[PDB]
């Protein structure tokens, strides 16, 4: 068939950018030619990870007119996404974008992004990749395919470690992250829309900042972000979903549990902690359990992931399959599967959840 | 000399027969009197007791029979308060183990609260789940500090549709108090027990989505909820979530309870009762303790005595409930589940039903 070279530019050269790098290295015809980051420590580490020569820029505006790129990846702090997108949108080269979640951090940003994105002709993909985890993909196919009968309930449990230290401590305050239920939980709101094939009408949440980062001072201020919550989401069709989050439950062997209940069957998956975050040599595999109602007899199977695909990132192989899809979108050989529209809904959902917590009331979604 | 107790059973149906089988495992337990307005129920229950007793159609004659030291009530939910009132005004004041829910409406609860404070003899509300051996390990771990400061409690119940009962009593909200009372009082009460706190706010989303759509009473179908998510806030800032599906009987584990603190997480999985699962494929209950700091979860099976497990469908819990009630009858020990505990569980469930209906959280005092 012949591998077609795509020249990628990376705007933001931090932790997640380096994961993008390792996933692009598994995909023939993936050439990184330009990297931007205002911090040279980040560029040194990232160039080293790429392991071949590239052109670096401290500002993305020069990368955009460098003439070196066919497609962009944005992995900068959450509150910078809209501003970089605006510069891409007004650039005269119409370049495809894979923009990291959350696509934006406030309601004002979302209102503005919505108008600007509809006027842009090139593909814009929001990098919420969890659907591409092989076990999650099995649950989606089962739900969409009717293997559960009519679907009514969706539970998502994420039990994990506290937010990691980042460059300039950008992820410690709501003002830069959009809040925990945007930063961390947009993934889950979007899976709810995808799995249930419906739109949310009402969100209620209870949560707090109970445990984490109490001993970290940023100009004498303590982090204001949530570290645990319960969220209950209603949908137009009458389906209902629940998210449980703890950022202080890293002892849990399985970091994610997703369960779906229909009137014919239940299905569930358990996703292990990424090797880099768990005990060496105590690796569990992801499992899927299908539990029909009628002839009682559950079935459990492991869902293997290619060794190299799994080791290239910390999201159970998902970033690789995200890149296969984005590549196809760049070539015009496939559609954008996670759109700006999907991004905006996930953000508004998370924003509504944060407001619900703070004001002790459910929030309607329009 | 053990100390014999003569038990009277008011209500002689399915749960009464479980009470019977558990009492048969406890020396000094003699059933002498059974009451039930339906003779089919009495026949089946007498057969289960397997020795002669005196039967009555009405509990009022049982109460003055002279045959009893203590009572067990296992009648339909909406009859509890009326039987308790007759017990409360009886000349011989007898201890009562009254089945959940202790009552079905807010009017009943207001009335029960005043009447029960004026009654001198023990009244135990028979919410037994705390005595399931795996749940008891979770309670001790939470109370004992093994999790550090406790913040989160999740309870997931995935089970079969409500069973067919005598006179189809459990199909409408007006007789049951609604699903979040009938079925979920157990869970509201465990929340109060495990978190050692009082609720301030409750929110729920639920519907009647799947079950009993083909069972008709003059063209009317059951109006009861068959699935729900409930989120409960507590005075201290602790938070709990209950998930319920009455159409998820395919699940090998019927109950999942998890508790998260700032030092550790603990979780149990409770198997489906043998009588409701495939023969020969019974699973053991597991408890998993998951510390944060030295990564390294620990998993163990929690055995239950074979006869204790086979005597009931609540994983041995009814046995340990009866050990406690026995002590209360003898003046050897306190009532561990009081009427006050019953009322809180009911008002929690009633608030949850109102939350669903009004689309808003309901404040609790
Ligand atoms: N999809 C996922 O699974 C996933 C996982 C982690 C992070 N992310 C997202 O990736 C983004 C980056 O997070 P991270 O973990 O890489 O953090 P990081 O702190 O390791 O990297 C951020 C980098 O951006 C640079 N930067 C700061 N301001 C910039 C600007 N204006 N323009 C360009 N670069 C700028 C910083 O110098 C740093 O190198 C965020 O949106 C985060 O939410 C996504
Ligand atoms: N604690 C538990 O785990 C558990 C389990 C099952 C049932 N229960 C409770 O037990 C009670 C009975 O439920 P069940 O499953 O045994 O139902 P069932 O229908 O099997 O038995 C109920 C019995 O009560 C009798 N009855 C009806 N009206 C009566 C009255 N006025 N006085 C006396 N008896 C009367 C009926 O004739 C019938 O035999 C309910 O409160 C139910 O919620 C508790
Ligand atoms: O653990 S941190 O790196 O602090 C935070 C990150 O955690 C996961 O990777 C999520 O996918 C991601 O959305 C989030 O940005
Ligand atoms: O399955 S049914 O017998 O219809 C329903 C009953 O059964 C369960 O065991 C619960 O413990 C009990 O509280 C509830 O009333």
PDB file of C-alpha atoms in Angstrom, chain A residues 16 19-20 23 27 98-101 124-141 144 187-188 190-191 194-195 256 258 269 271 286 303-306 309-310 314-329 334-339 342:
ATOM      1  CA  UNK A  16       2.029  13.547  27.663  1.00  0.00           C
ATOM      2  CA  UNK A  19       3.797   9.574  25.352  1.00  0.00           C
ATOM      3  CA  UNK A  20       2.559  10.892  21.990  1.00  0.00           C
ATOM      4  CA  UNK A  23       3.101   6.044  20.198  1.00  0.00           C
ATOM      5  CA  UNK A  27       3.349   3.961  13.462  1.00  0.00           C
ATOM      6  CA  UNK A  98      -5.077  16.649  17.808  1.00  0.00           C
ATOM      7  CA  UNK A  99      -5.754  18.799  20.865  1.00  0.00           C
ATOM      8  CA  UNK A 100      -5.366  17.256  24.317  1.00  0.00           C
ATOM      9  CA  UNK A 101      -8.242  17.158  26.769  1.00  0.00           C
ATOM     10  CA  UNK A 124      -9.861  18.953  14.910  1.00  0.00           C
ATOM     11  CA  UNK A 125      -9.633  15.864  17.126  1.00  0.00           C
ATOM     12  CA  UNK A 126      -9.935  16.053  20.947  1.00  0.00           C
ATOM     13  CA  UNK A 127      -7.530  13.532  22.448  1.00  0.00           C
ATOM     14  CA  UNK A 128      -9.864  11.603  24.790  1.00  0.00           C
ATOM     15  CA  UNK A 129      -8.510   8.133  24.073  1.00  0.00           C
ATOM     16  CA  UNK A 130     -10.042   5.820  26.716  1.00  0.00           C
ATOM     17  CA  UNK A 131     -12.591   4.401  24.257  1.00  0.00           C
ATOM     18  CA  UNK A 132      -9.624   2.839  22.429  1.00  0.00           C
ATOM     19  CA  UNK A 133      -8.525   0.799  25.449  1.00  0.00           C
ATOM     20  CA  UNK A 134      -9.193  -2.774  24.093  1.00  0.00           C
ATOM     21  CA  UNK A 135     -11.354  -3.807  27.107  1.00  0.00           C
ATOM     22  CA  UNK A 136     -13.437  -0.593  26.933  1.00  0.00           C
ATOM     23  CA  UNK A 137     -13.910  -1.144  23.183  1.00  0.00           C
ATOM     24  CA  UNK A 138     -15.418  -4.572  23.937  1.00  0.00           C
ATOM     25  CA  UNK A 139     -17.929  -2.979  26.320  1.00  0.00           C
ATOM     26  CA  UNK A 140     -18.862  -0.359  23.730  1.00  0.00           C
ATOM     27  CA  UNK A 141     -19.450  -2.960  21.012  1.00  0.00           C
ATOM     28  CA  UNK A 144     -24.173  -0.723  20.870  1.00  0.00           C
ATOM     29  CA  UNK A 187     -12.851  11.208  29.692  1.00  0.00           C
ATOM     30  CA  UNK A 188     -15.704   9.620  31.692  1.00  0.00           C
ATOM     31  CA  UNK A 190     -17.576  11.497  27.124  1.00  0.00           C
ATOM     32  CA  UNK A 191     -17.656   7.698  27.541  1.00  0.00           C
ATOM     33  CA  UNK A 194     -20.651   7.370  23.705  1.00  0.00           C
ATOM     34  CA  UNK A 195     -21.732   4.191  25.508  1.00  0.00           C
ATOM     35  CA  UNK A 256     -10.765   1.594  36.485  1.00  0.00           C
ATOM     36  CA  UNK A 258     -16.675   0.148  34.150  1.00  0.00           C
ATOM     37  CA  UNK A 269     -14.182  -4.470  32.734  1.00  0.00           C
ATOM     38  CA  UNK A 271      -8.249  -2.006  33.981  1.00  0.00           C
ATOM     39  CA  UNK A 286      -7.363  -6.384  32.045  1.00  0.00           C
ATOM     40  CA  UNK A 303      -8.062  -8.798  27.019  1.00  0.00           C
ATOM     41  CA  UNK A 304      -4.386  -8.807  25.924  1.00  0.00           C
ATOM     42  CA  UNK A 305      -2.675  -5.726  24.545  1.00  0.00           C
ATOM     43  CA  UNK A 306       0.404  -5.821  22.302  1.00  0.00           C
ATOM     44  CA  UNK A 309       1.689  -0.735  22.455  1.00  0.00           C
ATOM     45  CA  UNK A 310       1.114  -1.188  26.186  1.00  0.00           C
ATOM     46  CA  UNK A 314       0.138   4.714  30.671  1.00  0.00           C
ATOM     47  CA  UNK A 315      -3.396   4.477  29.232  1.00  0.00           C
ATOM     48  CA  UNK A 316      -3.525   0.727  28.457  1.00  0.00           C
ATOM     49  CA  UNK A 317      -2.548   1.000  24.761  1.00  0.00           C
ATOM     50  CA  UNK A 318      -5.251   3.550  23.940  1.00  0.00           C
ATOM     51  CA  UNK A 319      -2.991   6.375  22.682  1.00  0.00           C
ATOM     52  CA  UNK A 320      -1.697   4.142  19.845  1.00  0.00           C
ATOM     53  CA  UNK A 321      -5.198   3.486  18.468  1.00  0.00           C
ATOM     54  CA  UNK A 322      -5.991   7.210  18.893  1.00  0.00           C
ATOM     55  CA  UNK A 323      -3.016   7.967  16.622  1.00  0.00           C
ATOM     56  CA  UNK A 324      -4.115   5.388  14.004  1.00  0.00           C
ATOM     57  CA  UNK A 325      -7.456   7.224  13.833  1.00  0.00           C
ATOM     58  CA  UNK A 326      -5.939  10.727  13.743  1.00  0.00           C
ATOM     59  CA  UNK A 327      -3.548   9.574  10.998  1.00  0.00           C
ATOM     60  CA  UNK A 328      -6.544   8.439   8.911  1.00  0.00           C
ATOM     61  CA  UNK A 329      -8.246  11.787   9.510  1.00  0.00           C
ATOM     62  CA  UNK A 334     -11.355   8.202   8.000  1.00  0.00           C
ATOM     63  CA  UNK A 335     -13.499  10.608  10.102  1.00  0.00           C
ATOM     64  CA  UNK A 336     -12.717  12.513  13.309  1.00  0.00           C
ATOM     65  CA  UNK A 337     -14.127  10.166  15.945  1.00  0.00           C
ATOM     66  CA  UNK A 338     -13.749  12.604  18.892  1.00  0.00           C
ATOM     67  CA  UNK A 339     -14.962  16.007  17.705  1.00  0.00           C
ATOM     68  CA  UNK A 342     -17.683  15.879  21.992  1.00  0.00           C
TER      69      UNK A 342
END
